[PDB]
Design a protein around this ligand. Structure first.
Ligand SMILES: *[C@@H]1O[C@H](CO)[C@@H](O[C@@H]2O[C@H](CO)[C@@H](O)[C@H](O)[C@H]2NC(C)=O)[C@H](O)[C@H]1NC(C)=O
Ligand SMILES: *[C@@H]1O[C@H](CO)[C@@H](O[C@@H]2O[C@H](CO)[C@@H](O)[C@H](O)[C@H]2NC(C)=O)[C@H](O)[C@H]1NC(C)=O
Ligand SMILES: Cn1cnc2cc(C#N)c(-c3ccccc3Cl)c(CN)c21
Ligand SMILES: Cn1cnc2cc(C#N)c(-c3ccccc3Cl)c(CN)c21
Ligand SMILES: *[C@@H]1O[C@H](CO)[C@@H](O)[C@H](O)[C@H]1NC(C)=O
Ligand SMILES: *[C@@H]1O[C@H](CO)[C@@H](O)[C@H](O)[C@H]1NC(C)=O
Ligand SMILES: *[C@@H]1O[C@H](CO)[C@@H](O)[C@H](O)[C@H]1NC(C)=O
Ligand SMILES: *[C@@H]1O[C@H](CO)[C@@H](O)[C@H](O)[C@H]1NC(C)=O
Ligand SMILES: *[C@@H]1O[C@H](CO)[C@@H](O)[C@H](O)[C@H]1NC(C)=O
Ligand SMILES: *[C@@H]1O[C@H](CO)[C@@H](O)[C@H](O)[C@H]1NC(C)=O
Ligand SMILES: *[C@@H]1O[C@H](CO)[C@@H](O)[C@H](O)[C@H]1NC(C)=O
Lengths: 724, 724
């Protein structure tokens, strides 16, 4: 038997996780019931019995225990908004007392809640305003009063910062001991609103109009102020006083973005600021002043990170990791050869020294001790698609140890890590190319305590299904390696010719050729429909340095699109490809590239599917779009904006079978984008397939919508390829 | 040769029409430049050489000649709004002086302009206000000052009064000699808004949000006041004093409509008002009082029209045609046997005598003189789907000649008529079954003056081509005779098995079975695809008495739906229908029925298309919906509002191939209705074909949109029927 479309849709084969949340340096919480496990021995004491809130009536969506382990935050009434944002109701359960707190409770529709890093102080955001509870039962002090819906965001992010800057709805940053609460403020007054219909339930007679402050490329942007309030001063009588930290003079000269907040010490905070032309960022180090009551960030302590070849950071300037005293940090930066390596910085000195080097990249700093820095990288075997954990010795940058390489080279080449509070322990998560494998390790000597999850359950029932295999490799192109991957059908015969589907993302810093094991739609097409699903990372892709990544700077819709074609050409020359049956499909950026490719008039692709595609960059949001395209003005880049639309390629669609799918409530890539593609294809008499999804958003994540779309796509694909 | 899909979409075979506009009792206008024709002789002159409005420097959309021949109104910058309404620029050109009037020009963005019936007075509506120009070059007196966009409509209808009441934007009515200007004023303050996205040209960055005041079933309706201004007593120093006529007591007691405005004499106007529950109408006849300067409807001249079996009138109460003295009028009302006939009403008495009877119906009173009454009915050969002109003698009700029946019995069976100003002449318009035929006649002796247009050119072209034939016939069912039509493939073979497309409307008072000749998509399918395309007039269809028409009262989505399914069984068992391959398709009400039929679970239909369907009656407009369904309240009819939705029938769709098409900027049947169907099909896991048309409205009528949809639909049918 094979991995059927149903298998994918109704999760017949589950990848078991071992999600843990470290509560201390010794212990971690697990949701078996909620257990406390001891890292040393693996013994567990039932922390919270499953049916304690059976006496509540509400469905508990999430739990959160205060750092001093005295109270638990209960989240219910979950109503999701955007990618990260949501609304919810909350009850604080006193663990000691063994009962809910009733007076001075947390309001309904709280946008964000977070415990201080130590103790049980609690800050939350209601109606765009910030509130602090020093104690779970006492009243909350009102920090901000300027909060106004769709207009002023205090402690939480507006649409664009949520999506494109912080990957988070939260804009609150406690100091390390919780003395201070730092927060951003967003002004959207003049940001214009994307508007679209919400049809809601059948019972709703007149559809509602949704209106989000959304800046499209070139539009007026949200502005940002940054504040820090002393939570160890809050009067029940006098209004809380918030101290502002203004952006650097070199940021105030025009449109900027606050792009990173990181606490250094108890009285030292770091702020990263980006220009709207995202090739220039400045980091401010801000020290608290007792005899001043304010926050100073010396012009001397500023650190610049810039890029002449493109934009700065992968998606934003990398965050710094400060040594206990906060007089030095490390942050990943592009080096002189354009590879992203760790740099040691001294608070007071302009120049850093790179502590790693080579033709590979540091993915992210993971934990920083007094003896050792722990990082993740793709150095092992020169494979950008793999991930290992490395320990680099602080006193000797030569003494580098791979802590996950050898553990299991055969089934494990893509690791993520989770360190306990003090990094005494770490949990390794390999997620390919064998089944995902979760293991616990003690860092003091790096020996492996025990296997947490190994997926024997999955492993067992799998040898029953004719599963597909992955091939990860590279083609040479202009004397450079470009990595690709293929999900190859079971019993792959290379003398037979196969239909190929190119799975595309190919946005900047994209990586679709990796060592991760996945059970998805591609798995089904390979397993059941015998279709090779191939993916390629061309110019513009990430984790291979700047020469590759920056190649599409100011030129979206050029090379990253040309290389998908080139790759598919190179696949055809690989012997096992039926070049009469080659498809391409992609979502968001992939939708865009797919459409760009399908309209290139190359003749390579018989057909394609574009889900939620960007159609022209002036339609997508400012932060992300301008980061690569600059501004759509005659004095900047308007020419290429004009030149890189899927509309302009409409005439070439006469050569292919197109399937265009979009959700009507997509706040992200607005239905507008597919609406203009269709009008384009209509205006030139191109027949194509379409599909809207009523009230689906960019996710198309509704259980039934997801089931509907993949079935629809499967039918289209099967039909493009003459497959009953 | 066949009638290919291209022939249809590119108008290879054009039907020449003969569009004329009478100007006197003996002359008419016709385009070639503008020509005047003398009806007696046929001798032609040139009224306006086209060589006069190229120096104009704007493309002229239409023209209007003043009833006294002195001036011509030019229409440019036509910008279409709803079915009838549009914005446009106007200039006035002197015909005696031969030059464009340069002073006091009609403002840009005029909503409506109209000459007086005699002379050259000019009434026009700009920014929801009414203005009058006695002389074109003179300044214009402003009649109303209450006008405000989307709220107060003076002299023009709102959305719903345009669509369902007056079938016109215009809400002005000049008295027979231009002395008085009667107008309705509409009030929308409280009408909820339909809001939808309009995306516009690709260069539009943020999509626009169209919002129209739109009363959905049971919603808050517009309110109408009525006025009459004396335009001969206007002065440029005092505001025009508008004399209101109030609706009768029986109408003010609840929500009502102004359904008909008709002048009887220089000093007498008949009003028809309708109750929101559209089964009761009152006709007030109002005389002008000479000393007052006010209007007065006597209760002794009220007239009631009501149905017990459903709603009043075919779609609304018929208009009266008054005798020269306005002491008497003729009106199509339904006789006691359920048949719509011409009744002869005396202004003062209550009962009327029916001057026509029979088990057929009168369609429209076309003209009356002192001696005769000219009407169109479906009497000839007992065919509700045929149309002939008849002449009945006012002095002898048994003296009824048929003016058209035997003119050309074979090609001609569906007539319409245009009489000269004083009805000395009339143009006859034959529509089928043969090639259309336009003829001119003098009514004195009822002889044929000349053949105006006989489509010789078209006849020539069709002699090669294998055109389809049309069978018009009926079937007994519950012992009542129900008509249908089949467009049949050329060389039709009663022993072959043809795929059948059922073409539907089937809404209240419909007729999809007539003798009219069409060069449409059904011609393509029959001619080229050898598909039989049939239409059936079931319960609810018009022009066959109230027994058949009122059958669906308060029960939309029942008998008309069921009678369409039975039609299919009936055809299938005639022996020449491949019962495996029967499809159904419709637009608007047609969409709905189709959708309802595909939800039936009857197993008869293999597929269907629904273009711009109603999905749930609570989504459609009040005036149209409540006419057949009453209010959607628990104490009225909410029950059946809820039973007759396509959504609830979604589980059944697993049995059929469904293509669902809808224009995103559809003001009529809102995209909402389709978005809800799609959602329901998703929630029950039914796969289907969908297609949206960006910015297309209810007609999906833009040149390139229209071609795309029929091409698309052709593929869907072509593959559903397994036709290569
Ligand atoms: C957010 O920014 C907006 C726009 O810059 C501010 O609104 C302006 O405020 C100034 C001074 O109060 C007024 O003179 C203008 O009338 C306002 N302009 C607009 C466009 O409304 C607003 O003050 C800011 N709000 C906060 C809390 O910072
Ligand atoms: C149209 O009707 C509305 C009511 O539907 C009128 O609005 C009312 O106006 C009067 C006088 O100003 C107020 O006393 C009422 O309270 C208003 N009602 C509402 C609901 O607003 C409106 O004035 C009328 N339009 C015109 C100008 O004739
Ligand atoms: C912030 N972020 C995190 N994961 C992301 C994935 C995608 C994609 N595909 C995109 C993206 C790129 C271009 C156009 C539209 C989208 Cl959604 C973004 C950035 N919005 C993402
Ligand atoms: C005013 N008018 C003129 N021709 C019309 C045809 C139809 C149809 N089918 C309808 C109709 C009926 C039900 C649902 C939606 C529509 Cl559009 C109307 C009423 N708008 C029409
Ligand atoms: C685990 O075991 C130790 C000693 O055996 C015990 O003291 C400790 O409380 C346990 N930890 C938990 C919370 O499971
Ligand atoms: C955190 O900083 C505060 C601020 O002055 C200080 O009082 C304290 O030493 C720190 N927290 C503790 C109690 O460890
Ligand atoms: C705090 O400030 C707000 C806004 O200025 C004001 O309305 C409120 O009265 C103040 N409250 C206190 C505690 O003084
Ligand atoms: C038709 O002919 C008559 C005379 O024979 C003439 O008086 C009349 O003007 C003509 N009609 C026109 C304007 O063509
Ligand atoms: C209409 O607008 C055009 C230009 O926008 C102008 O030239 C013309 O005079 C205007 N017409 C009137 C009647 O105001
Ligand atoms: C006419 O009426 C309007 C307000 O209704 C007023 O503004 C205008 O001045 C009036 N003109 C005269 C002459 O009364
Ligand atoms: C039109 O009718 C009015 C009112 O009845 C009358 O006074 C007037 O003389 C008529 N106008 C002409 C000359 O036709």
């Amino acid at each position: 038997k094979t991995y059927t479309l149903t298998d994918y849709l109704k999760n017949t084969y589950r990848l078991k996780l071992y999600s843990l949340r470290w509560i201390s340096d010794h212990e971690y919480l697990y949701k078996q019931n909620i257990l406390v496990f001891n890292a040393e021995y693996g013994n567990s004491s039932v922390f919270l019995e499953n049916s304690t809130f059976d006496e509540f009536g509400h469905s508990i969506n999430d739990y959160s225990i205060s750092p001093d382990g005295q109270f638990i935050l209960l989240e219910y009434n979950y109503v999701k908004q955007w990618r990260h944002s949501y609304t919810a109701s909350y009850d604080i359960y006193d663990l000691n007392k063994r009962q809910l707190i009733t007076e001075e409770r947390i309001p309904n529709n709280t946008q964000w809640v977070t415990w201080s890093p130590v103790g049980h102080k609690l800050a939350y955001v209601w109606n765009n305003d910030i509130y602090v509870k020093i104690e779970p039962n006492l009243p909350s002090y009102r920090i901000t009063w300027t909060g106004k819906e769709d207009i002023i965001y205090n402690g939480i992010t507006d649409w664009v910062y949520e999506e494109e800057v912080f990957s988070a709805y939260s804009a609150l940053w406690w100091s390390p001991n919780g003395t201070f609460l730092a927060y951003a403020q967003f002004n959207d007054t003049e940001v214009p609103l994307i508007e679209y219909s919400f049809y809601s339930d059948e019972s709703l007679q007149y559809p509602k109009t949704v209106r989000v402050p959304y800046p499209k490329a070139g539009a007026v942007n949200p502005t940002v102020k940054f504040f820090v309030v002393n939570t160890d001063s809050l009067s029940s009588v006098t209004n809380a006083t918030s101290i502002q930290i203004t952006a650097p003079a070199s940021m105030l000269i025009g449109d900027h973005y606050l792009c990173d907040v990181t606490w250094a010490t108890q009285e030292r905070i770091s702020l990263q600021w980006l220009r709207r032309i995202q090739n220039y960022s400045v980091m401010d180090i801000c020290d608290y002043d007792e005899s001043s009551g304010r926050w100073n960030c010396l012009v001397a302590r500023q650190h610049i990170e810039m890029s002449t070849t493109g934009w700065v950071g992968r998606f934003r300037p990398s965050e710094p990791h400060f040594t206990l005293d906060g007089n030095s940090f490390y942050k990943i930066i592009s080096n002189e050869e354009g590879y992203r390596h760790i740099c040691y910085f001294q608070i007071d000195k302009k120049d850093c020294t790179f502590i790693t080097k080579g033709t590979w990249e540091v993915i992210g700093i993971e934990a920083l001790t007094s003896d050792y820095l722990y990082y993740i990288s793709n150095e092992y075997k020169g494979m950008p698609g793999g991930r290992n954990l490395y320990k680099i010795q602080l006193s000797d940058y030569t003494k580098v140890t791979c802590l996950s390489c050898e553990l299991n080279p055969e089934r494990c080449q893509y690791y993520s890590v989770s360190f306990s509070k003090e990094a005494k322990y770490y949990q390794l998560r390999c997620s390919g190319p064998g089944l995902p494998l979760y293991t616990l390790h003690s860092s003091v000597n790096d020996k492996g305590l025990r296997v947490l999850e190994d997926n024997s359950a999955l492993d067992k029932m799998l040898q029953n299904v004719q599963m597909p295999s992955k091939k990860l490799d590279f083609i040479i192109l202009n004397e450079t390696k470009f990595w690709y991957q293929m999900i190859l059908p079971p019993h792959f015969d290379k003398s037979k010719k196969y239909p190929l589907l190119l799975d595309v993302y190919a946005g900047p810093c994209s990586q679709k050729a990796d060592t991760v094991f996945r059970l998805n739609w591609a798995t089904y097409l390979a397993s059941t429909e015998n279709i090779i699903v191939a993916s390629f990372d061309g110019r513009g892709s990430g984790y291979q340095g700047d020469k590759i990544m920056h190649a599409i700077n100011r030129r979206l819709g050029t090379f990253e699109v040309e290389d998908q074609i080139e790759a598919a050409r190179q696949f055809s020359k690989m012997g096992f490809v039926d070049n009469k049956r080659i498809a391409i499909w992609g979502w968001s950026y992939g939708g865009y590239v797919t459409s760009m490719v399908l309209g290139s008039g190359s003749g390579v692709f018989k057909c394609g599917i574009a889900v939620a595609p960007v159609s022209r960059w002036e339609y997508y949001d400012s932060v992300y779009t301008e980061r690569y395209m600059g501004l759509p003005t005659p004095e900047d880049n308007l020419d290429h904006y004009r030149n890189s639309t899927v509309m302009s390629r409409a005439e070439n669609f006469k050569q292919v079978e197109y399937l265009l799918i979009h959700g009507t409530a997509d706040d992200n890539v607005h239905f507008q984008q597919s609406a203009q593609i269709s009008k384009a294809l209509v205006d030139v008499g191109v027949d194509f397939q379409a599909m809207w999804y009523t009230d689906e958003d960019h996710g198309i994540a509704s259980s039934t919508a997801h089931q509907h779309i993949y079935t629809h796509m499967s039918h289209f694909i099967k039909q493009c390829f003459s497959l009953p």
